[PDB]
Amino acid sequence: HVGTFENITAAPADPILGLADLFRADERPGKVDLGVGVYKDETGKTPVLTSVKKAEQYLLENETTKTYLGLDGLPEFGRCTQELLFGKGSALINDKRARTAQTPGGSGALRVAADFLAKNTSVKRVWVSNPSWPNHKAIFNSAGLEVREYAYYDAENHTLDFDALINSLNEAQAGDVVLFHGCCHNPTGADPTLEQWQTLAQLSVEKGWLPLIDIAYQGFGRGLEEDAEGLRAFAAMHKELIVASSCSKNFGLYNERVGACTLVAADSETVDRAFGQMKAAIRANYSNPPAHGASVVATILSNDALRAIWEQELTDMRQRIQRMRQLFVNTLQEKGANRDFSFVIKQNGMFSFSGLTKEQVLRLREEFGVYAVASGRVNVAGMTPDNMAPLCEAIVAVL
Amino acid sequence: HVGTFENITAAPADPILGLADLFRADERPGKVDLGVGVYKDETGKTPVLTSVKKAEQYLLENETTKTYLGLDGLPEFGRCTQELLFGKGSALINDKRARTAQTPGGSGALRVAADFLAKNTSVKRVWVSNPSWPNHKAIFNSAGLEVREYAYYDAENHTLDFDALINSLNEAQAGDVVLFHGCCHNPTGADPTLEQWQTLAQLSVEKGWLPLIDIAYQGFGRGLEEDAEGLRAFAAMHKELIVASSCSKNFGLYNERVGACTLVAADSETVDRAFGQMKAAIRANYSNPPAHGASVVATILSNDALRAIWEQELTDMRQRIQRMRQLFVNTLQEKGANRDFSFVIKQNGMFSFSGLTKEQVLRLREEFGVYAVASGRVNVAGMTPDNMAPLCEAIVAVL
């Protein structure tokens, strides 16, 4: 009998992993990795937040069981998540129109949403932005859902081409899902203004789309509340929506897999009915979600002092990112960049498209030891006041 | 337009939660919960193990980042898992034939295995015992795989009807997956002898089944090494295996979602191809597995002192369960039970089928506050020296 695994085709090499290997083997002292996918501080570290360490100590000292939680996880974490998303006192929460399942990361939430939609609704198609966050397609396709892209970023002029966006969405049908990044669009950093969000929300009601908001950077754009404005504009106008939220970045809890899938429906009866089926989707997957990270988040958010420490940590991250954005632009100008990069200070979060070609990206790595991903996406948190001049000189040299 | 969620039909109520609800509302003091699905100690608690607390303290002190690891999780956890499953000096390990992805519990492992099989192999069918763990069907069905049942337990006579088992498996085709519980069959507690495992292993090679060993109770039957005998009998004889392992029960890490999916193939290059695609299945699901529980397990197993503590704790759990089995039988006899329950003494792990009718189970609950599941499955870890007499008196009264 031939082996069941004998003829499996190798998965394509991960170009990201390959760059990471090359980088760690690179012995040049001047090397700089702008391709990284997580936050880094000024020293190049991705530390455990102090608020998280404190919460973990509290759990160490107080947890008396690790017995299974329900399929939807820790109720307190669900409540905290809904408040972050919709605001405390939200009419939506008061009307009991939202149900939240804690999931292993926003990634887990996206897959749970995908499986739930596939098994219980007529949704066939999910629309995502161009450029897309690479992982959306794999997740939705895995559940049997088609993924299509709508117009979003004007790469030549470095803008969110809103008119192109709206027009391209005319192709989306009632009952399709349209996925928007809540804030800090990954990878462009180009977000709708509030007016644009309101226009999108109205359009979604007129066209009958089911909005899915992927929000993994609440707090990295302009602030916690500001960053939720778009989501809330949608929540105000829609009877239904899905939110896949993450605490990986804003709590620095990446590997603990802390996020949630929130369902909103027209009324309590409907959302409860839907949620029962979402729980079934969870039962057929990983059964119940990992407690530690969600416990940490609930612990931080349900304590005034810890929460304040965390909010400052988040503000510090946001502001370092903004500083690097401004310093990048100014240093490019100082180094004689032959064109303007002001778009960088108009963009939110750790990622922007540099506008560099793949050839320029290659040249940057080979000649200058400056690493970016093929798309030209750079993580400004990979920049520091000490590495900024040489990396900008390098960029100017390849323009 | 409206409601994508409006036409969703209600999930059937799950009687488990229903029974938990009933139990919770039951204010009677004599309550005995034999329906629970986790280990409980003599005081009726599901504690965090001391070895685990020590490991968590060490992590708090030493961890400096929670940045994403690979989709396969923590390498050291993978290695320790493999060593537990296959033993020191395993030729299989020496030949580099195994790869392990840390997953969110054995449940996550089973789903990942299912998705990996569905997307990359010709497996159409997974065979499970009658009865088996209730979630197997949902998990495999979710991935598009049919689930079929093989004969296993003779409920009238309280035996693993091995001849019935073997014959029923003649229907399993080459390339089908056949799932066996590694030890402490859930829910019967009836395990194959080593000779029976060897017979199954040989049959499996002859018939070309892909064995999937679901092992969630290693150490609860006869001991760590003994409980792996079955798995190892399969490993000795097979070019390919999948193991879904869990640390939920033997480390008391239930809600941290610590388990693994281990692929074994004919050789290193083959298992690498398979493993790459398993990683893709993970990427389309929850992406990274949750670090905390796996870090705990790796910390314990890679330290001689901590490991020795953990093994003693595991022995204590195993031995308590065995003592309750013995005590249950002796107490029923002394209480004049109108029949023999001696089958309970030889069964392995925390579960047995009591043989009580649903009428008797209902009466047990309504009249005596003794809670079993409708199937008559009892969790003997729900028994204690203190509750044993009234428990057995209630049972005698309903016989």
Description of the molecule:
- The structure is a homodimer of 399-residue chains.
- The first copy, chain A, folds into 2 domains: 14-47 and 319-399, Aspartate Aminotransferase, domain 1; 48-318, Aspartate Aminotransferase, domain 2 (3-Layer(aba) Sandwich).
- Chain A is 45% helix and 13% strand.
- Chain A has helices at 15-25, 50-62, 75-86, 91-94, 105-120, 134-142, 162-168, 194-207, 224-227, 229-237, 268-283, 291-301, 304-334, 358-368, 388-398; strands at residues 32-33, 98-103, 125-129, 146-150, 153-154, 159-160, 177-181, 210-215, 241-246, 259-264, 351-353, 370-371, 377-379.
- In chain A, the strands form 4 sheets. In chain A, strands 2-10-9-8-7-3-4 form a 7-stranded mixed sheet, with helices on both faces.
- In chain A, strand 7, helix 8 and strand 8 (210-215) form a beta-alpha-beta unit.
- The relative contact order of chain A is 0.17.
- Chain A is built from 15 helices and 13 strands.
- In chain A, helix 8 (194-207) runs parallel beside helix 10.
- The longest helix of chain A is centred in the last third of the chain and has 31 residues, at 304-334.
- Chain A has 399 residues and is an alpha/beta fold.
- At the A-B interface, helix 2, helix 5, helix 6, helix 11 and helix 12 of A face helix 2, helix 5, helix 6, helix 11 and helix 12 of B.
- It is classed as transferase.
- Keywords: Aminotransferase, Transferase.
- The assembly is dimeric.
- Rational Design and Directed Evolution of E. coli Apartate Aminotransferase to Tyrosine Aminotransferase: Mutant P2.
